[PDB]
Amino acid sequence: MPVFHTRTIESILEPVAQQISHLVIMHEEGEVDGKAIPDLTAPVAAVQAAVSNLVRVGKETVQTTEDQILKRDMPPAFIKVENACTKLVQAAQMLQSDPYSVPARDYLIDGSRGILSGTSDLLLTFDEAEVRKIIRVCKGILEYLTVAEVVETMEDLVTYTKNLGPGMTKMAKMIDERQQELTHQEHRVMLVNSMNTVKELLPVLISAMKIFVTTKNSKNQGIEEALKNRNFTVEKMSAEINEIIRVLQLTSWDEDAWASKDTEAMKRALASIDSKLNQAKGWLRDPSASPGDAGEQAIRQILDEAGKVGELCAGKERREILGTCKMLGQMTDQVADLRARGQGSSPVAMQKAQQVSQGLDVLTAKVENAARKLEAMTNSKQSIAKKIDAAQNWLADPNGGPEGEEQIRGALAEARKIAELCDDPKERDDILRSLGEISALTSKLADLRRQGKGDSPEARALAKQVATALQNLQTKTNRAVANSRPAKAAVHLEGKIEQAQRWIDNPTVDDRGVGQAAIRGLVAEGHRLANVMMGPYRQDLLAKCDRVDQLTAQLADLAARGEGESPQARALASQLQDSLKDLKARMQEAMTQEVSDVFSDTTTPIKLLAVAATAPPDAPNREEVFDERAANFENHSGKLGATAEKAAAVGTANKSTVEGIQASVKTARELTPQVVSAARILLRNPGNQAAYEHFETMKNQWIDNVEKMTGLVDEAIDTKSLLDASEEAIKKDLDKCKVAMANIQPQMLVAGATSIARRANRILLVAKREVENSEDPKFREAVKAASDELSKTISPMVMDAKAVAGNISDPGLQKSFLDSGYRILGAVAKVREAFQPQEPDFPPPEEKDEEFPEQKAGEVINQPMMMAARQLHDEARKWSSKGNDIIAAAKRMALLMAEMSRLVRGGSGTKRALIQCAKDIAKASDEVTRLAKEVAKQCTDKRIRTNLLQVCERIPTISTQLKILSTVKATMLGRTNISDEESEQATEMLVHNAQNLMQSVKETVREAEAASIKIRTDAGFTLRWVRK
C-alpha cells in the first residue's frame, strides 16, 4: 500500500519508482518478448545510491532517538530494503552472466516491488514521528483546557492566560507548517478551518472566565449563564482540537469524512423537531387555524427534518421514514383543505388532525431511534480510536501494565459493538475474526514481558505484529461504519443534476443509489423553498416536485422489473429529465427572491436585543420585553441560516463557497444562544463593565460572521440576476409607498422607504465587491461611476421620506418623495448597465476527433475507471479541440484512460503498456495544468482566476501518484495467479486517483471557459470555445 500523504514522500518515491519503472520494461521485455534482459550494472547500481543514503539517515536517526515507537517501527523498515536491493544486486549478477536466467528474472520482479514498498514504509516512519510531536502539543492544550473550570481566582486566571497563550501560539505555528506540507488539499482545509475556530474561541474563553470571576464571586443572578458559556466555549474548542489530532493522523483519502456532519446534522433535526412539536400540534388542536400560518409550517418543518434524517438511513428505515412523511403531509393537505370550506369542525377535520398529530409522535420516535443507532457507531468508532492510541504506548514499553493491556481488551470489546450494530453479516464476521488473533498475540506477549521482557527485538515481532493488527482492525471497523451509511449525492446544484441525468440514462447500472438520491435532494430543496412561499406559488412548486417524485418512482420501478429500455421508460425519462430543468430554474429564481427578503435587514433584531439588555433596572415590562426580543432574535438567526443553506444548495458556486456558507451557518447556530445569554447576563447584572465587554464582544462577533454569510450568499446569486431582482423589489417597494400615502399611514410609507434605502445600499456593497474583484480598467470605472451616482441618490429620498411622514396626504411632499424615489431607480439602472455583457464586435472543411471505444463484449473492464474516462470524455465531447489545446488534452486522456480501464486487471504484456499509459496521461496532465495557468493569468476576474488556479495545484499531485501507483501494479500484475490484500488495495487506490483526476479535468475545463469571457486587451490569444 503506497502512501504519499506528504510532499517529501512523493518527492522521494517519484524518482525511485521511475528507475524501477525502467527495470520492469526490460524484465517484461525478456519475459514475453524475444531477446532477454541486457546488462544492468549501472541502473541497478542507481537504485542503490538512492535507498542507500535513505537507509543510512534512518540509522543515524534510530540510534540517536528517544522515541520508542521509532525505535521499534523503523528497524524492520531498513531491513526490508536491504534485502530488496541485495536481491537485485544478485539478480543482476545472474543477468550479467546468463541474461536469460529465468530464476534470476524473478529475483527482480519480486525484488523490484520490495524497493518500492520498503522505501514507502520507511519514509512513513519518519512522518508518524513528526506527527506525534504535533499531537503531543495538542493533547496538552486539551488537558490544560480541563483546568479552565477550576479557576475561581483572578491571579489564578492570569497564570492561566499566560500559560495557554504561548502553547496555543506554538500549536498554531506547528499546524500551519504541517498543512503547508500535505498533498491532500481537503486535509489542508479541515486543519486550517479547525485551527481558525480554535483561535477565535480563545478570547471568548478568557472573556467568559473574567465575567465568571465577577458574578460567581458576587453570588447573584448572572452566573447562570457565566459557567454556561465558559463551559460550552471549552467543550467546542476541545472538539476541534480533537478534530485536528484526528485529521493529522491521516495518510490518504478521508474515510468517514461525513461521519461528523452526519451525527451533528442528525442533532439539528432532532432539536428542530423538538422545538416545533408543540407548535404544529397546537394547529391540529384547533379546527380554527388558518391553512398557512406558523402552525401549518411547523408540521412541514418537522417533516423536512424527518426526511433529512431518513436520507441518512438505509433502505428500510430510509423508506419507512420518507414514506411516513409523505402520507403525514399529504394528510395535512386534506386537513387544512377542509378548513377551506368552513367545515374545519367537520367530524373529519378534527379526526384527521388528530390522526396526524399522533403520527407525528410515531415519526419522532422513528427518527430518534435512527439517530441513536448512528451515534452508537460514532461513539464506538471514537472509543476504539482512543483505546488503540493508549495501547500504542503500552506496546512501546516492554514494561507495560495490565492497564495498557486493558486498553486492547476494550478496543476489541468496542469493535464488538460495531459488529453487532452491523447488518451485513459478512462484514461483522470479518471483524469478530480478527479479535481472536489480536486477543491471542496480546496475551502471548504479555507473558513474555514477565518471563524475560524480551527488550531485545524478539517481542517486537509481536508488539509490532499487534500494533499492526490493531491498525488493520481499525480499518475493517471504519468501513463497516462507512458502508452503513448510504452514498451521498453531490453537494452543489450542478453535480446533482449531472448524477441525476446519468441514472436517468442507465437506470439499470449501479450508481450506488446516488442518482435517485440526487433527485431526492433536489425535490427536498424544492419543498424547502416552497414551504416558505404563498398561495399558488408554494402550491405550484410543490406541484412539479410531486411531479418529479411520481416520474422517478415510475421509471425506477420499470427499470427494476427488467424493462430498462421500454417506450414509457423513455416517455417517462423525457417527462422527467425535462421536469428537473423546469425545477432547477424554478428553484433558482425562487431562492434569489428569498434572499432579497430574509437578508434585507440583518442587524435589527440583535439591536433590540442589545438595547433590551442594557435597559434601566426600573424599565416597565422588564424581564418580559427582553425575552420577547431574545426570541425574535434566535428566530431570525435561524431563518438567515436556513436561507443561506438553500443558496448553498441551489445557487452557483463549487464546493468552494458551499462549504464556507455551510460553515458560517453552523457557527451562527452556536453563537446564537451564546450571545442570547451574554445579553441576559448583563440584564440581571447591570453596570458591571465586564458585562458590556463580553456582550459587546459576542454581538460584534456574531455581526461579523453574518456579513461573512451575507457576502457569500450574494456570491451564490448571479450578479445580473441580483441587480434585476433588486430593481424590481425597489419598484414594488415604491408601490407599497404609493398605497401608504393613498391610505395615509406614515408607518407604512416609511417602512417602504426604509427597505428601499437598505436595498440600494446592498447594491452599493455588491458593486464595491464586484470592483475589488476586477483588474479591468473599463469595468471598474464604468461600475465605479454608476455606483457613485447611486449613493447621492440615497439620502435625499430618506429625508424626503421623512418630510412626508407628517403630511402624508399633503402633495408637494409626496411628489418630492416619489421624485427622489425614481431618481434612485434611475441610478440603479445605471449600475445595472455597467454589468451588461459586452456587445459583440467585427473582425471550414472539417474536424474529425476520434469516437469513444466502449464495445468490448464483456471484456475485462474496471467499471469505476471506465466510468471516469467516459464521464470526462463526454464533457470535453461538447466542444471542439480546434484552437483549444485544453480541449484536445482532455479528449485525448479520456481515451488514454479507457486504455487503462483494460490494463488495470492483469493480462498479457500489460505490465509495460501500463507504465506507458500513465506516462502518456501524465504528459497530457502537464499540458492542461500549463494552459490553465495561462488562462488564469489573462483573466481580469480575481475570483475565477483564483478558482482556476485552485483546480490546477491538484492535477500535478494526482498525476504523479497515478504514476507511482501504476508502477506498483505493474510490479504485481506480472503474476496473474493469486489475490491478496496488496494487489487488491493498490488497485483500489489506483481507481481513486483516476477518479480525482478525471474530475479535476472536467473542472479545469469548466472554469477555463468561465474565465474566457473576462479576458481583455487580447494579449497572448485565447482558446476558441465553441460547441460542436
mmCIF file of N, CA and C in Angstrom, residues 388 869 993:
data_model
loop_
_atom_site.group_PDB
_atom_site.id
_atom_site.type_symbol
_atom_site.label_atom_id
_atom_site.label_comp_id
_atom_site.label_asym_id
_atom_site.label_seq_id
_atom_site.Cartn_x
_atom_site.Cartn_y
_atom_site.Cartn_z
ATOM 1 N N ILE A 388 -6.967 2.297 20.935
ATOM 2 C CA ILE A 388 -5.824 1.846 20.157
ATOM 3 C C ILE A 388 -4.643 2.792 20.367
ATOM 4 N N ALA A 869 -13.387 7.866 -17.252
ATOM 5 C CA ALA A 869 -12.935 8.209 -18.595
ATOM 6 C C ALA A 869 -14.135 8.657 -19.406
ATOM 7 N N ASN A 993 -7.425 7.635 -7.540
ATOM 8 C CA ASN A 993 -6.609 8.676 -8.182
ATOM 9 C C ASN A 993 -7.127 8.958 -9.594
#
